[PDB]
């Protein structure tokens, strides 16, 4: 009954209680744990136990007391019907899973036994539904095929039953408890349809009944907001219908397929029309109806397509009717997020048809649709009018953005039908979009939507119109929204530009307004893709940019990208002008920093910006800049002291340093680095990050000394209290080794430096694995794994390996079964493997000695299973996954 | 943790057009693939099963292509531009290089490029087998 | 979840396939459940296998029968993991 404490804090504690559900006493304590008058909290745990045990430990069951188990479960169900809900349901499912096992009549007597009045039926239904799903996971020690086969033999009973119940209810009074039971009923069926398969030919009966059930839920509310009960029941009716057509086998039943689809259509049309009304009462019903149609077409592509061309009359009409519903669905009014939740449904559908026809006349037959659709999209591509002034919540706005993404993708797709034709329609809608603002200048929605539609196709005369239109549009007159789109749509057309002069005009202009970031992105795109072309305007932009930065109005965050465009523009500058521009554009950044160098949390920010700005400008300017860095190297030392205690600023400065250092390889920089790093070291994670980066580009003295200092300093930090600090040291432990690992593969002759103290390295490396960080353990491991690799090639290093030989594999086996979390076990099979390829013989012995000849690789694991795992581990040197399997099994058997 | 995300891109924007091969694995298991060849733009999309996401990950974790960096690497050049963006859990990466035995050696870290260009093949081969069956054809 | 039919039929994604595993091995335990429309066993860095295969069955009855019956298979030493290759949505 200790589980109670856990219910107030389930998450941070489980493990105990769970394994207790595994022990055979679980059977004895469950029924006692869920007695009368006891807390529902533990009673649910009493129920989950019996359940898990019935599916997981049927192996620990006495065939002699089989029926007892049932009678046992039947009594509880009786006690809990009316008591706690969650429990009853759990008991019901327990009764079901029980039955699953008896399959190899049971399903027929279960039904008979149950065919309070109301409750009784709930029990039965819940019981029968839980059956096909348990059989899906329940371990019956029986081949799956026969467990499926047995159940598939009683489907008709299930449905025919439900189908019988429903109709029976179609004549009586629909009690609240009646809807609910009818829900279970309809859901029961559905579950059996997706889990077990039945011929569509026998689903026509129920299909029709459910249909009328739906109707009986929708039409009384029309005169259309229905109770949740009617809605839940409706959905479930609909979902089951979906499950009915989607079946995998149905596709070959062109006959039942048409029949059912025709009845779905001719019976659901009305409801669709009524909800397409603007007085929204249920958006729920229409999504499922529209969903069902869209889906039923997916499952039967051939019927739909063949109806188009082979044109069986019955099909040409059906198909057109099915598409009209979906087309309507797509064209449905309102913004996707707020007014009509069916837009996604329709977009999903077109994708299928468009790809299905591309994978005949169907292409031409789809053109009209495709064309019409495109228009609809742009229509839905229209952002919410500020009339509603976004009375919506960002959720909706955030989701709309996602929506638009799917809507622009759909655009793309239809572009594949008409490479240029789509361009025509978009133009047409833009011309109208012209007559929209023309008559009513408040129609920016249609302007932004139209523009948006064009940008949507920017990934492939109609086009330039767009450009001109953008120039003509007086963006300062309409809502800020147009400026952001206009600019963004232009950025996407970077390629088509390679019309550039006005592009600049727009971007620079777009910077003036609220939406700077947008213009920023647009600019950066242009700079990256058509640099040569902007050379004439490089002198201009570069200077126009420096000015735009002056106002503090521009966001620093965004201002950084402008720095990117600048650096890219500078490249296209003349000899004379470059440095002066750099001076005019870089000096401020350093001096600002310098001022702060005077010597706070408010200063930390300014420090970061200036540092990143350079970092960026450098990044793009690496496409020289050496003189700039030469006279700068000293200030990074200074910034480090200010930032000695703040990694944030630290990382910021290093990045800057790194990006500029990149230019040197392609040499005076190396000197201040050892100076800048000698100040940094004087042991956060970024610090070693650069040391490695610097080192890896120098593949001799400059590098060896920095690495040697690099190792010896790390130890000092690593020298903190092993117990806590080491745990606390997770970040640096991962990093340090991650770097010493990368430095190994490249810069290999490095392992050559006899100077390096490896015994020390490994000393700590074996600890990290045994660390408390969830992932840093891979680094230590990864490191060791790559040392053993090179170690087999250098006697010098081999020594270290020989000594650390049995020690490592020991450290590995300790974590793998006693110290390393259950999940991070596989990360060790790397070192165990690296040791078999270079030292198979040695590893074969260090393994037997630590596993077969130890008192306790673990106390629980069996000497037998221990000896065999030890054998497999040493035999597999060609597979790492295998190791992970042999490793894991033992890992389990080890911890118990 | 659900942060898995993979993407790739390799194409040249010459005067003759933008040839390319760029596919992407979305978090929800959506595999969009696009490729325009000039011996035509073949769009493709599909939701790969959980397990496929797992394999993409496994291949990535064993290639240790998450440690490497394009810092010393050859940036994109007139001839080409390769992109790789992987994210697994709380670690996100994205690389930039040009398309391509000697060119890789002459690069700062040939071992860096060798791993990168080696994973790409491991991913290329997968996304191709995936598509090559769902739609009956690879790119030529 | 939710399997997806492919142009050629239904496909499964077999994971945990031995590294030395050849088309013959996979083609040995997957033909017993139906006439596989196609098969696929993806090598790299001279490694004979990549650990996975796209087994395709004309039907879905066979695909599932296999998916369930071949889930714990232990070929060439390692156990395998058979899953539906393509699902139909997130």
Short mmCIF file of N, CA and C in Angstrom, two decimals, chain A residues 351 355 359 405-406 409 412-413 416 459-460 495 498 528-529 662 692-693 696-697 699 738 741-742 745-746 778-779 782 785-786 830 880-881 884, chain B residues 13 15 18 26 30 32-33 41-46 55 58 61-64 66-69 71-72 75 81 83 91 108-112 135:
data_model
loop_
_atom_site.label_atom_id
_atom_site.label_comp_id
_atom_site.label_asym_id
_atom_site.label_seq_id
_atom_site.Cartn_x
_atom_site.Cartn_y
_atom_site.Cartn_z
N UNK A 351 -2.63 15.53 -52.42
CA UNK A 351 -1.31 14.95 -52.49
C UNK A 351 -1.39 13.54 -53.08
N UNK A 355 0.08 12.57 -56.74
CA UNK A 355 1.19 11.62 -56.83
C UNK A 355 0.79 10.31 -57.48
N UNK A 359 2.42 8.63 -60.90
CA UNK A 359 3.06 7.33 -60.71
C UNK A 359 2.23 6.20 -61.32
N UNK A 405 2.47 26.32 -44.43
CA UNK A 405 3.55 25.49 -44.93
C UNK A 405 2.98 24.35 -45.77
N UNK A 406 1.97 23.67 -45.25
CA UNK A 406 1.35 22.56 -45.96
C UNK A 406 0.64 23.09 -47.19
N UNK A 409 3.15 23.82 -49.87
CA UNK A 409 3.70 22.57 -50.36
C UNK A 409 2.73 22.04 -51.41
N UNK A 412 3.28 23.82 -54.58
CA UNK A 412 4.39 23.18 -55.25
C UNK A 412 3.91 22.01 -56.06
N UNK A 413 3.40 21.00 -55.37
CA UNK A 413 2.92 19.81 -56.03
C UNK A 413 2.11 20.05 -57.29
N UNK A 416 3.74 20.79 -60.50
CA UNK A 416 4.23 19.67 -61.30
C UNK A 416 3.24 19.34 -62.42
N UNK A 459 10.40 27.94 -55.61
CA UNK A 459 11.36 26.84 -55.56
C UNK A 459 11.33 25.99 -56.83
N UNK A 460 11.15 26.65 -57.97
CA UNK A 460 11.10 25.98 -59.27
C UNK A 460 11.89 26.75 -60.34
N UNK A 495 17.44 33.70 -56.69
CA UNK A 495 17.91 33.05 -57.92
C UNK A 495 17.39 33.70 -59.19
N UNK A 498 19.27 36.55 -60.63
CA UNK A 498 20.53 36.33 -61.33
C UNK A 498 20.24 35.80 -62.74
N UNK A 528 24.16 36.00 -50.57
CA UNK A 528 24.69 34.65 -50.71
C UNK A 528 24.57 34.03 -52.10
N UNK A 529 23.49 34.33 -52.81
CA UNK A 529 23.26 33.73 -54.13
C UNK A 529 23.63 34.54 -55.37
N UNK A 662 40.25 30.73 -38.75
CA UNK A 662 40.04 29.89 -39.93
C UNK A 662 40.80 30.42 -41.16
N UNK A 692 41.62 22.27 -29.26
CA UNK A 692 41.48 21.17 -30.22
C UNK A 692 41.40 21.71 -31.65
N UNK A 693 40.46 22.64 -31.87
CA UNK A 693 40.24 23.25 -33.19
C UNK A 693 41.56 23.82 -33.73
N UNK A 696 44.02 20.82 -34.47
CA UNK A 696 43.67 20.07 -35.69
C UNK A 696 43.95 20.71 -37.04
N UNK A 697 44.34 21.97 -37.04
CA UNK A 697 44.64 22.64 -38.30
C UNK A 697 46.13 22.85 -38.46
N UNK A 699 48.54 20.23 -38.68
CA UNK A 699 49.08 18.90 -38.94
C UNK A 699 49.63 18.83 -40.36
N UNK A 738 35.98 14.46 -25.78
CA UNK A 738 35.47 14.57 -27.13
C UNK A 738 36.55 15.18 -28.00
N UNK A 741 39.60 13.11 -28.60
CA UNK A 741 39.21 12.02 -29.49
C UNK A 741 39.32 12.47 -30.94
N UNK A 742 38.83 13.67 -31.21
CA UNK A 742 38.89 14.23 -32.56
C UNK A 742 40.35 14.52 -32.92
N UNK A 745 42.28 11.08 -34.37
CA UNK A 745 42.09 10.65 -35.77
C UNK A 745 42.85 11.53 -36.76
N UNK A 746 42.63 12.84 -36.67
CA UNK A 746 43.35 13.77 -37.52
C UNK A 746 44.51 14.12 -36.61
N UNK A 778 29.83 8.32 -23.31
CA UNK A 778 30.18 7.89 -24.64
C UNK A 778 31.53 8.48 -25.04
N UNK A 779 31.78 9.71 -24.61
CA UNK A 779 33.02 10.43 -24.90
C UNK A 779 34.23 9.70 -24.35
N UNK A 782 34.27 6.59 -26.25
CA UNK A 782 34.70 6.89 -27.61
C UNK A 782 36.19 7.17 -27.64
N UNK A 785 38.17 4.01 -27.04
CA UNK A 785 38.02 3.17 -28.22
C UNK A 785 38.96 3.55 -29.35
N UNK A 786 39.21 4.85 -29.51
CA UNK A 786 40.10 5.35 -30.57
C UNK A 786 41.58 5.37 -30.23
N UNK A 830 31.54 -0.46 -27.85
CA UNK A 830 32.52 0.14 -28.76
C UNK A 830 33.95 -0.17 -28.33
N UNK A 880 28.87 -5.03 -34.04
CA UNK A 880 28.79 -4.22 -32.82
C UNK A 880 27.40 -4.34 -32.23
N UNK A 881 26.42 -4.58 -33.10
CA UNK A 881 25.04 -4.71 -32.66
C UNK A 881 24.94 -5.97 -31.82
N UNK A 884 25.97 -5.47 -28.53
CA UNK A 884 24.90 -4.76 -27.85
C UNK A 884 23.82 -5.71 -27.35
N UNK B 13 24.28 25.59 -58.76
CA UNK B 13 23.46 26.56 -59.47
C UNK B 13 24.23 27.20 -60.61
N UNK B 15 24.74 28.21 -64.88
CA UNK B 15 23.97 29.00 -65.82
C UNK B 15 22.91 28.12 -66.49
N UNK B 18 19.61 24.71 -61.88
CA UNK B 18 19.96 24.20 -60.56
C UNK B 18 19.77 22.69 -60.39
N UNK B 26 11.71 14.44 -41.35
CA UNK B 26 11.05 15.24 -40.32
C UNK B 26 10.81 14.47 -39.02
N UNK B 30 8.19 12.06 -41.34
CA UNK B 30 7.81 12.43 -42.70
C UNK B 30 9.09 12.56 -43.50
N UNK B 32 10.34 13.81 -46.85
CA UNK B 32 10.21 14.46 -48.14
C UNK B 32 11.53 14.30 -48.89
N UNK B 33 11.44 14.06 -50.19
CA UNK B 33 12.60 13.87 -51.05
C UNK B 33 12.38 14.60 -52.37
N UNK B 41 11.56 17.41 -62.30
CA UNK B 41 11.68 17.61 -60.86
C UNK B 41 10.79 16.59 -60.16
N UNK B 42 11.41 15.59 -59.55
CA UNK B 42 10.68 14.54 -58.87
C UNK B 42 10.42 14.76 -57.38
N UNK B 43 9.20 15.20 -57.07
CA UNK B 43 8.79 15.44 -55.70
C UNK B 43 8.34 14.11 -55.13
N UNK B 44 8.58 13.90 -53.84
CA UNK B 44 8.19 12.66 -53.16
C UNK B 44 8.09 12.94 -51.67
N UNK B 45 7.15 12.29 -51.01
CA UNK B 45 6.98 12.47 -49.57
C UNK B 45 6.33 11.22 -49.01
N UNK B 46 6.63 10.90 -47.76
CA UNK B 46 6.06 9.72 -47.15
C UNK B 46 6.47 9.61 -45.69
N UNK B 55 16.97 3.49 -37.45
CA UNK B 55 18.12 3.11 -38.27
C UNK B 55 18.90 4.33 -38.73
N UNK B 58 20.90 5.18 -35.75
CA UNK B 58 21.98 4.23 -35.49
C UNK B 58 23.17 4.47 -36.41
N UNK B 61 24.98 7.54 -35.28
CA UNK B 61 25.72 7.41 -34.03
C UNK B 61 26.99 6.57 -34.15
N UNK B 62 26.99 5.60 -35.05
CA UNK B 62 28.16 4.75 -35.25
C UNK B 62 29.22 5.42 -36.12
N UNK B 63 28.78 6.34 -36.96
CA UNK B 63 29.70 7.06 -37.84
C UNK B 63 30.32 8.24 -37.11
N UNK B 64 29.88 8.48 -35.88
CA UNK B 64 30.39 9.58 -35.07
C UNK B 64 30.51 10.87 -35.88
N UNK B 66 28.76 13.27 -35.64
CA UNK B 66 28.18 14.32 -34.81
C UNK B 66 29.27 15.07 -34.05
N UNK B 67 30.47 14.51 -34.07
CA UNK B 67 31.60 15.12 -33.38
C UNK B 67 32.30 16.08 -34.33
N UNK B 68 32.47 15.63 -35.57
CA UNK B 68 33.14 16.42 -36.60
C UNK B 68 32.55 17.82 -36.78
N UNK B 69 33.32 18.68 -37.45
CA UNK B 69 32.91 20.05 -37.73
C UNK B 69 33.46 20.46 -39.10
N UNK B 71 34.54 23.34 -39.85
CA UNK B 71 35.43 24.48 -39.65
C UNK B 71 36.64 24.48 -40.57
N UNK B 72 37.39 23.37 -40.61
CA UNK B 72 38.57 23.35 -41.48
C UNK B 72 38.21 22.94 -42.91
N UNK B 75 34.69 24.90 -48.06
CA UNK B 75 33.35 25.47 -48.19
C UNK B 75 32.81 25.22 -49.59
N UNK B 81 27.80 22.49 -53.71
CA UNK B 81 27.48 22.87 -52.34
C UNK B 81 26.71 21.76 -51.64
N UNK B 83 25.13 20.13 -48.04
CA UNK B 83 24.61 20.52 -46.74
C UNK B 83 24.13 19.31 -45.95
N UNK B 91 21.55 17.90 -29.22
CA UNK B 91 22.72 18.24 -30.01
C UNK B 91 22.35 18.44 -31.48
N UNK B 108 41.99 20.38 -44.88
CA UNK B 108 42.54 20.41 -43.54
C UNK B 108 42.48 19.02 -42.88
N UNK B 109 41.26 18.50 -42.71
CA UNK B 109 41.01 17.18 -42.12
C UNK B 109 40.42 16.25 -43.18
N UNK B 110 41.25 15.40 -43.82
CA UNK B 110 40.72 14.48 -44.83
C UNK B 110 39.89 13.43 -44.10
N UNK B 111 40.26 13.17 -42.85
CA UNK B 111 39.55 12.22 -42.01
C UNK B 111 38.18 12.80 -41.66
N UNK B 112 38.11 14.13 -41.62
CA UNK B 112 36.83 14.75 -41.32
C UNK B 112 35.89 14.57 -42.49
N UNK B 135 7.92 4.16 -54.93
CA UNK B 135 7.56 4.74 -56.22
C UNK B 135 8.19 4.13 -57.46
#
